[PDB]
Scaffold this motif. Structure first.
Motif, PDB file in Angstrom:
ATOM      1  N   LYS A 145       0.866  -1.211   0.000  1.00  0.00           N
ATOM      2  CA  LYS A 145       0.000   0.000   0.000  1.00  0.00           C
ATOM      3  C   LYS A 145       0.887   1.241   0.000  1.00  0.00           C
ATOM      4  O   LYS A 145       0.659   2.111  -0.848  1.00  0.00           O
ATOM      5  N   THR A 146       1.890   1.287   0.884  1.00  0.00           N
ATOM      6  CA  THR A 146       2.617   2.522   1.283  1.00  0.00           C
ATOM      7  C   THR A 146       3.890   2.756   0.452  1.00  0.00           C
ATOM      8  O   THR A 146       4.293   3.912   0.391  1.00  0.00           O
ATOM      9  N   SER A 147       4.523   1.734  -0.132  1.00  0.00           N
ATOM     10  CA  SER A 147       5.874   1.831  -0.760  1.00  0.00           C
ATOM     11  C   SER A 147       5.803   1.677  -2.282  1.00  0.00           C
ATOM     12  O   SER A 147       5.414   0.593  -2.753  1.00  0.00           O
ATOM     13  N   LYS A 148       6.239   2.704  -3.011  1.00  0.00           N
ATOM     14  CA  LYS A 148       6.418   2.653  -4.482  1.00  0.00           C
ATOM     15  C   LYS A 148       7.308   1.453  -4.832  1.00  0.00           C
ATOM     16  O   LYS A 148       6.923   0.650  -5.703  1.00  0.00           O
ATOM     17  N   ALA A 149       8.451   1.330  -4.155  1.00  0.00           N
ATOM     18  CA  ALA A 149       9.490   0.308  -4.431  1.00  0.00           C
ATOM     19  C   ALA A 149       8.881  -1.090  -4.362  1.00  0.00           C
ATOM     20  O   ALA A 149       9.186  -1.909  -5.238  1.00  0.00           O
ATOM     21  N   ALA A 150       8.077  -1.335  -3.332  1.00  0.00           N
ATOM     22  CA  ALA A 150       7.439  -2.636  -3.048  1.00  0.00           C
ATOM     23  C   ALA A 150       6.372  -2.910  -4.106  1.00  0.00           C
ATOM     24  O   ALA A 150       6.318  -4.042  -4.620  1.00  0.00           O
ATOM     25  N   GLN A 151       5.541  -1.912  -4.405  1.00  0.00           N
ATOM     26  CA  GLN A 151       4.486  -2.033  -5.441  1.00  0.00           C
ATOM     27  C   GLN A 151       5.130  -2.568  -6.719  1.00  0.00           C
ATOM     28  O   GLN A 151       4.671  -3.611  -7.207  1.00  0.00           O
ATOM     29  N   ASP A 152       6.176  -1.895  -7.209  1.00  0.00           N
ATOM     30  CA  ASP A 152       6.846  -2.227  -8.493  1.00  0.00           C
ATOM     31  C   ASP A 152       7.307  -3.689  -8.469  1.00  0.00           C
ATOM     32  O   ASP A 152       7.097  -4.369  -9.472  1.00  0.00           O
ATOM     33  N   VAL A 153       7.876  -4.168  -7.361  1.00  0.00           N
ATOM     34  CA  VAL A 153       8.336  -5.582  -7.220  1.00  0.00           C
ATOM     35  C   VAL A 153       7.131  -6.512  -7.387  1.00  0.00           C
ATOM     36  O   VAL A 153       7.127  -7.335  -8.317  1.00  0.00           O
ATOM     37  N   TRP A 154       6.143  -6.376  -6.510  1.00  0.00           N
ATOM     38  CA  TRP A 154       4.933  -7.236  -6.500  1.00  0.00           C
ATOM     39  C   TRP A 154       4.246  -7.207  -7.872  1.00  0.00           C
ATOM     40  O   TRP A 154       3.829  -8.269  -8.335  1.00  0.00           O
ATOM     41  N   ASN A 155       4.146  -6.036  -8.501  1.00  0.00           N
ATOM     42  CA  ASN A 155       3.417  -5.851  -9.782  1.00  0.00           C
ATOM     43  C   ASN A 155       4.209  -6.509 -10.913  1.00  0.00           C
ATOM     44  O   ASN A 155       3.614  -7.323 -11.631  1.00  0.00           O
ATOM     45  N   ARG A 156       5.495  -6.198 -11.064  1.00  0.00           N
ATOM     46  CA  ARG A 156       6.364  -6.838 -12.095  1.00  0.00           C
ATOM     47  C   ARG A 156       6.106  -8.349 -12.064  1.00  0.00           C
ATOM     48  O   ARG A 156       6.003  -8.953 -13.153  1.00  0.00           O
ATOM     49  N   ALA A 157       6.020  -8.911 -10.851  1.00  0.00           N
ATOM     50  CA  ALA A 157       5.926 -10.359 -10.568  1.00  0.00           C
ATOM     51  C   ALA A 157       4.519 -10.853 -10.884  1.00  0.00           C
ATOM     52  O   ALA A 157       4.391 -11.894 -11.553  1.00  0.00           O
ATOM     53  N   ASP A 158       3.514 -10.133 -10.396  1.00  0.00           N
ATOM     54  CA  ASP A 158       2.083 -10.472 -10.600  1.00  0.00           C
ATOM     55  C   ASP A 158       1.795 -10.480 -12.099  1.00  0.00           C
ATOM     56  O   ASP A 158       1.206 -11.475 -12.576  1.00  0.00           O
ATOM     57  N   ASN A 159       2.230  -9.435 -12.814  1.00  0.00           N
ATOM     58  CA  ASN A 159       2.063  -9.333 -14.286  1.00  0.00           C
ATOM     59  C   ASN A 159       2.735 -10.537 -14.943  1.00  0.00           C
ATOM     60  O   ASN A 159       2.158 -11.095 -15.894  1.00  0.00           O
TER      61      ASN A 159
END
Lengths: 48, 49, 132
Positions: free
Chosen positions: C27-41
């Motif tokens: 929710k709170t971290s740009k850096a974390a979002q990008d990791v989870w999203n790259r992976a989820d995609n």
């Protein structure tokens, strides 16, 4: 609908047309919306 | 598609239509025809085009 | 500019994983979002499941559908998952996913209590939590 030519087309026929076209489009549209809402891109429903 | 196989105003002329070299259908025949469109082969065909 | 005291990072193994893990950070971290999203995609596009969905909702069963041109491309990726052994000089091939063939319309992952603790999902899930 039987014995309803052009000049007889009225309430029954306009309703019949709703069942047999407009609300089939609507029905298809609904299951489209429900699948897309859940990101279901790879389980198409075959419409006969 | 001949109805419940009873005397209809449409059924009584079916035998007559067939004398033209043309085919009318029982409901079971037409159901078979339609269920033939849910075979894996034509399900996959629908997905192409 | 002053060095921190001498630091060692240690990364946790399987067994620790928990439903919803890493999602507060998501929710709170740009850096974390990008990791989870790259992976989820990556998982959604190549294997037709969401690693985020599995971490968030920990479903008991999850079934992948091979419908349409997008679904056959995904099925290939499931079939193209092989064992590359080299026996007698020549290469030999062995299918992970014996059930998935040219005639498969779907494949289902099962687990008693939730897919998040079936190691094939647990490992990427845990890896991402940590990398994020």
């Amino acid at each position: 609908e039987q014995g309803i030519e052009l000049e007889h087309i009225d309430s029954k026929s306009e309703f019949a047309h709703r069942i047999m076209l407009t609300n089939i489009l609507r029905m298809m549209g609904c299951v489209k919306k429900q699948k897309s809402a859940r990101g279901i891109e790879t389980r198409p429903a075959q419409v006969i | 598609t001949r109805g419940t196989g009873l005397m209809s105003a449409n059924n009584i002329i079916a035998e007559g239509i067939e004398k033209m070299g043309v085919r009318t259908f029982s409901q079971k025949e037409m159901a078979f025809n339609l269920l033939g469109l849910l075979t894996p082969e034509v399900v996959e065909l629908c997905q192409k085009s | 500019e002053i060095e921190q005291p001498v630091t060692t990072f240690v990364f946790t193994g399987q067994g620790s994983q928990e439903q919803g893990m890493g999602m507060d950070l998501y929710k709170t971290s740009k850096a974390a979002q990008d990791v989870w999203n790259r992976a989820d995609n990556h998982f959604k596009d190549t294997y037709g499941f969401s690693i985020l969905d599995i971490v968030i909702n920990n479903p008991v069963n999850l079934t992948i559908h091979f419908g349409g041109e997008k679904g056959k491309r995904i099925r290939e990726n499931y079939s193209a998952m092989i064992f590359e052994t080299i026996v007698d000089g020549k290469l030999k091939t062995e299918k992970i996913f014996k059930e998935i063939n040219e005639h498969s319309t779907s494949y289902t992952f099962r687990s008693e209590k939730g897919l998040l603790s079936a190691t094939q999902f647990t490992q990427p899930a845990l890896t991402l939590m940590e990398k994020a």
